[PDB]
Amino acid sequence: VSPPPPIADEPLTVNTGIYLIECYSLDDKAETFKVNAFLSLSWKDRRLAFDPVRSGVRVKTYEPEAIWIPEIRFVNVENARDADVVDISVSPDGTVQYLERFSARVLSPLDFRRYPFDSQTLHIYLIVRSVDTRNIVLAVDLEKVGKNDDVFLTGWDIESFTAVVKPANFALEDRLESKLDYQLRISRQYFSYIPNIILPMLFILFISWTAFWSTSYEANVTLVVSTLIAQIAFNILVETNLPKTPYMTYTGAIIFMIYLFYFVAVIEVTVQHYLKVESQPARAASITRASRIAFPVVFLLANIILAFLFF
Amino acid sequence: VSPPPPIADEPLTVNTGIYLIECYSLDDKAETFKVNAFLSLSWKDRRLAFDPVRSGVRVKTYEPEAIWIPEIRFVNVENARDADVVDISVSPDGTVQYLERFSARVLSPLDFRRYPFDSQTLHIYLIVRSVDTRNIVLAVDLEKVGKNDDVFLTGWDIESFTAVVKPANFALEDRLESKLDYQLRISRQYFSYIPNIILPMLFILFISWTAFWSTSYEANVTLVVSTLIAQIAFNILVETNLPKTPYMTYTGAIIFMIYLFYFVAVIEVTVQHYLKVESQPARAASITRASRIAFPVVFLLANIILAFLFF
Amino acid sequence: VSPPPPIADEPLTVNTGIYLIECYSLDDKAETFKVNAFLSLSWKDRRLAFDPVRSGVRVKTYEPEAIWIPEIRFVNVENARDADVVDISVSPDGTVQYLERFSARVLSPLDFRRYPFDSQTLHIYLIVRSVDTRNIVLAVDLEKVGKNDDVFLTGWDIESFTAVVKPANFALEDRLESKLDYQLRISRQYFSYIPNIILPMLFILFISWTAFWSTSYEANVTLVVSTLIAQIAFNILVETNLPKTPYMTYTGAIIFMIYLFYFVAVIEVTVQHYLKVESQPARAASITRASRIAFPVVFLLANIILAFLFF
Amino acid sequence: VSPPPPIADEPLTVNTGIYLIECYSLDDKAETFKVNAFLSLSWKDRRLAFDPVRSGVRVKTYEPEAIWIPEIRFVNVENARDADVVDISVSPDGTVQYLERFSARVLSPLDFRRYPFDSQTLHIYLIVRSVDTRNIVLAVDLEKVGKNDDVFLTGWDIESFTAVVKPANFALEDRLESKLDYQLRISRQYFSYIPNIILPMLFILFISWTAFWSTSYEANVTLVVSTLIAQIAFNILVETNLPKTPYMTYTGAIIFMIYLFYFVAVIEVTVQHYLKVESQPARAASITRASRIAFPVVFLLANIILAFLFF
Amino acid sequence: VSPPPPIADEPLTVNTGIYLIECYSLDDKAETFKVNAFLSLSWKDRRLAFDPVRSGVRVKTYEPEAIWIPEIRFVNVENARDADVVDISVSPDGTVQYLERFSARVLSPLDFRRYPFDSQTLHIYLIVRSVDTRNIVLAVDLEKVGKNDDVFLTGWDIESFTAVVKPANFALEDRLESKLDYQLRISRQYFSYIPNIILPMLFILFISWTAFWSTSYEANVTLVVSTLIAQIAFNILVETNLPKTPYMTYTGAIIFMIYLFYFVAVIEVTVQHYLKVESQPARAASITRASRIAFPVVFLLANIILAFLFF
Ligand SMILES: [Cl-]
Ligand SMILES: [Cl-]
Ligand SMILES: [Cl-]
Ligand SMILES: [Cl-]
Ligand SMILES: [Cl-]
Ligand SMILES: [Cl-]
Ligand SMILES: [Cl-]
Ligand code: NA
Ligand code: NA
Ligand code: NA
Ligand code: NA
Ligand code: NA
Ligand code: NA
């Protein structure tokens, strides 16, 4: 079977729609997500036209192999989608209504700059290649675009699922390609990060700051170095669920800042001890008393600067 | 083959049944489980009717390709089920009895609020999309719903496998859809959590509390900070088997509370030392003696409040 | 093709045999193992009977599609087996001899009560569902049951591969189902657990007991708390390769007992220090001297009691 | 269908092209990457030639089964590629234009000598085996070689995708083989390694160096040994994402050098203490004062030597 | 299609050959490897004889389904190989030349006794089962056995790929089976183990030995116990990439020996302290001075004995 012939020289319009049934496995490190959806396609094939009077039927059902069907592919998929044809219906005028249910692993890049208080626009790119006989063009049937209310993406809030109605028309391997952009806007559920990562990091940092109320170097060394090891465990835990980015992320900047604060607290502990041994405890006492205010104040200010730069 | 024609304008009833053979791989983090079951379907096709006296046969066996079979799908599956047709039997009145054995990975959300003392209702949603010729509606044959006695879901107790007999009939993309809810009620075997997680956390907490019977700051710092590191290892171990939730879980609340208790014990250890250095051991002794009772009492009370709020 | 018709009303006997070629991937946590084997089936089909004089052949080879073959499935499999028909042969009396080679992931529950000194009976359940026309029942051809000498299951000793000759016949959805139990008896190679887990745990426990020959609280705290952290690493390492059981395992009981011993050694270290500070070293010396004998003696006795209860 | 017959004894030229749509999952440890691309093939089949005026059509479309197609394979793939034929077009002279879209996991070795400041040349080898009737030879159509602007390989910069135009024609099992080398030049985005690995390693090293301003052996031991444990954590974290190489890598050399520096700092700490105990603090003070300059200077010089040897 | 009939009563010889294209993923823990190779088969089928004058061609090409092909399987594979037929060429006498390219995961046991300085002989077992009509026997065509020069197995050196030319013809389930052994001799690239595992273990052991130059029990306890924890991390790292063996491995023996050395160093540290407290520093000094020589000497001797016993 060849494509439908044109009445004049107009392109063949394939109306499309994606109805999301499931959205799962958003892998941040892999920058992929899995989707289970309906793909609806509609186009006119005059060769399939019939008179409902002489036929006795108002609609005709067909098998995919019996008629011409446009080769629609997804651009940003790992492997070709797994699809199952649900229905193919032809109306008297020859308007074909195709419906399939598919599952696919989608490759969509993520911006981790504001992580874990980030939002993303996931893309699903639909494409059709033109044939020598005629130019095939994609369109969006907005009445056939949507998502199930039960669609839950673990650790994310689904804001909207819309399509950019105008296709991207360009040449690829000496043939025209029509590309539609389906956009799934999501925002991260940051809740869990506060009691599980943010607050534990602060607690161990505040424990390291008790060294500013102690003159015992041996105890101070234990306090700062042991809390540093606990911080390193949290840093490793955090960075393992993120890919390596060529830019600084919000969490990355915080982690880096905390390393500086631990390093400076070691300098203070070292300086205070050196002075006490040099029989200068009065000078050490002045530094330690200043540190009690300076460290929390500089920590709060540095965080305000960071939050400002990132948000 | 087209669907059976109606005698009057009634919808076509497809009687369904699921008999669980196996239940395995309940992934908490992924909120998925694997199922191996029988799917039984039954409907009337008058075109397949015969005389049992003339035909000499009481039943006729058919191949799937030879007759019309409703397209039944699962809503909450990763990929389409892997099915093998076991039998297709037609009775003289034309009643078709279809049986297949399938395996599928089911997506079902879990409520971790009461974890690890939680119970879940896992769902298996059966669906049929109506055709242009006629409306297809689902029903439950309770005599064909059940589970194998040997069905074991590692770390869970299987309470019941029932079906909500009334289908959810709704319009989806200008066609009727008939959905059935099969519910598998399970409860977590919390046993192991007590000797492996709960009791070890308490032991290391009680070890940190020996600092209330010591005046040695250096030893106290070692006790509280080393036990905190051991607690962090347990917290990481626990939270790795749970997904990130937009709500507080029972275990999460306990873990958070323990962080506060460790932080307050550091404050006590710090305060006691500051007083001893300031030549005020009498005041420190009063605080340390109070801490010996206050810490276990406040720990027990806070746990009673938490258990009350969650259960 | 329909099943062979009965001479009288007798059920159709399908003789079976499983010859193990490979046994691999015994996953304890998943309670699954992978098998690669031959499945032999044999039954009489009188419609296939012939005269070897007239036909000039003593055996007839057939393609699966050409003749009736019983639908044999495995009960306890993740997904349906991956099978390849090797041969189908018919003798003059109509005795069919079928042979296939298959691979399958088998779900078989394990008893971890005596771990790592445990033995298991892995099961492979063959099943057949009776048809409308006649009742099918399974049997064991013992001459066709066996295993290759090279069959190695990493970390296990293979004791025997036998079949329970009488099937477990029963009704499932108003049809006879004939079930055969193939049992693979295995025992764990416990060797490695001794130098890798058992002896390291004892060494670090004995190191913690050197605190009974020291009066230095700061050193004692370091000894007991550092060895506890090392023990926690071994406990995590051990429990990660085991599933969560609703019963106590031998290793679990040992791990729990060691936690008590560490907790009691902290109590001793704390008590000894409190007395020395209270200017009572004579009383502390009596306790520490008693501990030197009491701890190893109670440890040995508690282990004898545990080994007795579990073995 | 047999291959096209030669006009004279010339080999059959199959013009090739690869257009990269997606590049993902560059696994360093596995030395593999996943590719989703277009494979274009073009060759002359005179049997397929036609008159454009007589046939009325300027281009004829064919199904793969209808015509002869060369068996093209990839040399360095895990499994055979997953391909979907997009188009097959024949021009009047019999020039066939084939296009498929494929996905494949490519095995390509990596040079980790300069890691994480390394660049790689990933290879995709195209191969054809000659037939008994005629010799098949490969060629590159440069107009059909390229990549999508959006092609992003996480943690890498894509420099170029070119093909070595001269094929490697060699005998293999008494038949000609024609191999083409497609080269994807990439360079690692080293950014993240600086704040996440390099700077943390330096901070903990500088903390260990505060022992050169302390006379307290107990504190010094804690400083050097605790920071060594933190370094071991980073070394394990680093080496887990790299395969075991039969050569030294840049990161490996740095890690080894840091071990020496920690070992030498322990020697210093030990020597200083031995002298103080031997009532020689003047000699110890000379060594510790020298160490304050010697350690950072030798560290900087050793790093300059290493960077010179590796770059 | 049935097998070729014999001219006399001779068995049918199937000449074989394996040409390795790729060797990857040698999993030590799983005792598997992945292979991508050519499988060449050759046998005579007189029924396929043709006159090249009448057929117009000197060599016939066939589709697998069109002619009789021996059922060749691999014994030691996880699942049946993934194969793609490259060519089937029949010459006028009826000599068939079959070629396929396959990928398979091979199960081959490994001897870890000399790990990481071990060598292995990986096996690929080819098998054919005889039919009812005639006995099938395998042979090796040495001109069709080999490997690609580029064949790289990460972390291994490939020594040779040869075949044991004499098949193992044996009875299995009342039929002849003909088995060929293809042996891939490999040796481990031990390089990386020296700077990454061996030397770090020695450095931390030497750090623990600085306790023999210290009289400070609290510092000594910190030194020996902290380095023991670092050693435990290396032991876990090492043992995780090895399966549980029912024998002692070279690395296992070293790891066990190091535990003894750490345990004995704790005994020394404990004894030395007990004597100093008992006002006997002269006796302690004699033990500590002896330990400075005894520990490195006994360590070197024990390693010579171990290397001798294993190599
Ligand atoms: Cl697709
Ligand atoms: Cl489904
Ligand atoms: Cl099966
Ligand atoms: Cl029954
Ligand atoms: Cl029955
Ligand atoms: Cl390929
Ligand atoms: Cl195979
Ligand atoms: Na079509
Ligand atoms: Na059908
Ligand atoms: Na059949
Ligand atoms: Na310490
Ligand atoms: Na073809
Ligand atoms: Na064949």
A218 part of contact set with chain B, CB < 8 Å:
yes
**DSSP letter, residue D295:** H
Domain borders along chain D are 1-192, 193-311
The two structure tokens encoding residue C295: 């701890």
Chain center to CA of A104: 16
Resolution for this PDB entry, in angstroms: 2.7
Tell me whether residues B132 and A61 touch, CB distance under 8 A. Answer: yes
Nearest to C189 by CA among E110, E242, E245: E245
The two structure tokens encoding residue A194: 């506060």
Distance CA D211, CA D220 (A): 5
The two structure tokens encoding residue B21: 């053979």
For tokens 């077992």, name the residue: E125
**DSSP letter, residue D53:** H
Nearest to B195 by CA among E201, E35, C235: C235
Radius of gyration of chain E (CA): 31
For tokens 């070292």, name the residue: A270
Helix (H, G, I), strand (E, B) or coil at A201: helix
Within 10 Å of residue C290's Cβ, how many Cβ atoms?
12
H-helix or E-strand spanning residue D97: strand D95-107
For residue A14, the distance in angstroms to the closest alpha carbon of chain B comes to 17
Distance CA B256, CA B253 (A): 5
Helix (H, G, I), strand (E, B) or coil at B116: coil
Confirm or reject CATH 2.70.170.10 for domain D1-192, answering yes or no. Answer: yes
Distance CA D244, CA E26 (A): 13
C-beta separation of E180 from E75 below 8 A:
no
C-beta separation of A212 from A288 below 8 A:
yes
Q: At what angle do helices A217-239 and D217-239 cross, to 10 degrees?
A: 10
Nearest to D87 by CA among A70, A171, A65, A45: A70
The nearest alpha carbon in chain C to E259 belongs to C200
C-beta separation of A102 from A73 below 8 A:
no
C-beta separation of E34 from E157 below 8 A:
no
H-helix or E-strand spanning residue D36: strand D32-44
Judged on CB neighbours under 10 Å (0-12, 13-18, 19+), A89 is: middle
C-beta separation of B98 from B48 below 8 A:
no
Asked if omega into B167 is within 30° of 0 (cis), the reply is no
The two structure tokens encoding residue D191: 């950014």
Nearest to D176 by CA among D138, D130, D131: D130
The answer for B 101-160 residues in CB contact with A (under 8 A) is 107, 109, 129, 131-133
Distance CA C59, CA E6 (A): 17
For tokens 């093209």, name the residue: D72
B chain contacts of residue C221, beta-carbon cutoff 8 Å? 219, 222-223
Ligand whose nearest atom lies closest to the CA of B66: 9
Residue A168's contacts (CB-CB under 8 Å, 6 or more residues apart) are A177, A178, A179, A180, A181
Nearest to D30 by CA among E22, B208, B160: E22
The two structure tokens encoding residue E239: 């043992």
Distance CA D65, CA A103 (A): 28
Distance CA A65, CA E145 (A): 45
Residue E300's contacts (CB-CB under 8 Å, 6 or more residues apart) are none
H-helix or E-strand spanning residue C181: strand C176-188
The nearest alpha carbon in chain E to C237 belongs to E236
Ligand 11 centroid, distance to B222 Cα (angstroms): 6
DSSP string over E246-306: SS--HHHHHHHHHHHHHHHHHHHHHHHHHHHHTT-HHHHHHHHHHHHHHHHHHHHHHHHHH
Helix (H, G, I), strand (E, B) or coil at B3: coil
D25 part of contact set with chain A, CB < 8 Å:
yes
Judged on CB neighbours under 10 Å (0-12, 13-18, 19+), E106 is: buried
The two structure tokens encoding residue B108: 């079902």
Helix (H, G, I), strand (E, B) or coil at B231: helix
Within 10 Å of residue A165's Cβ, how many Cβ atoms?
12
C-beta separation of D210 from A266 below 8 A:
yes
Distance CA A110, CA A119 (A): 9
Distance CA A266, CA A228 (A): 10
**How far does chain B reach from its first CA to its final CA, in angstroms?**
56
The answer for E 37-66 residues in CB contact with C (under 8 A) is none
Helix (H, G, I), strand (E, B) or coil at D297: helix
Query: Residue E151 to residues C217, D185, E24, E158: CA-CA distances in angstroms?
Result: 61, 22, 9, 8
Asked if omega into E92 is within 30° of 0 (cis), the reply is no
The answer for D 170-199 residues in CB contact with E (under 8 A) is 172-174
C-beta separation of E268 from C213 below 8 A:
no
Distance CA C151, CA C21 (A): 6
Distance CA C227, CA C224 (A): 5
Distance CA A255, CA A240 (A): 13
Within 10 Å of residue E245's Cβ, how many Cβ atoms?
19
Distance CA B276, CA B268 (A): 12
The CATH number corresponding to B193-311 among 3.40.50.300, 1.20.58.390, 3.30.70.3270, 3.40.50.850 equals 1.20.58.390
Distance CA B149, CA D227 (A): 56
Residue B293's contacts (CB-CB under 8 Å, 6 or more residues apart) are none
Q: List the single residue in A189, A199, A226 with the smallest CB-CB distance to B246.
A: A189
C-beta separation of B9 from B134 below 8 A:
no
Helix (H, G, I), strand (E, B) or coil at B50: coil
**DSSP letter, residue B77:** B
Distance CA B55, CA B61 (A): 13
Tell me whether residues A132 and D58 touch, CB distance under 8 A. Answer: yes
Q: Are strands E175-188 and E156-172 parallel, antiparallel or unpaired?
A: antiparallel
D chain contacts of residue E219, beta-carbon cutoff 8 Å? 217-218, 221
Distance CA C255, CA C248 (A): 11
What is the total residue count of chain E?
311
C-beta separation of A78 from D103 below 8 A:
yes
Alpha-helical (H) ranges within chain C are 52-55, 193, 199-208, 217-239, 250-277, 281-310
A chain contacts of residue B256, beta-carbon cutoff 8 Å? 195, 199
Q: List the single residue in D195, D219, D226 with the smallest CB-CB distance to A229.
A: D226
Phi/psi of residue D54, each to 5°? -70, -45
Max Cα-Cα span within chain E:
112
Distance CA D86, CA D102 (A): 10
Task: Return the amino acid letter for B292.
Answer: R
Distance CA C185, CA C65 (A): 37
Ligand 1 centroid, distance to A80 Cα (angstroms): 4
The two structure tokens encoding residue D194: 């600086």
**DSSP letter, residue D193:** H
Judged on CB neighbours under 10 Å (0-12, 13-18, 19+), E13 is: middle
Question: Partners of C125 in the beta sheet?
Answer: C181
State the Cα angle at E224 between D206 and D251, rounded to 5°: 40
Q: How was this structure determined?
A: X-ray
For residue A170, the distance in angstroms to the closest alpha carbon of chain B comes to 31
Nearest to C268 by CA among B145, B210, D238: B210
Max Cα-Cα span within chain D:
112
3-state SS track over B258-287? HHHHHHHHHHHHHHHHHHHHCCCHHHHHHH
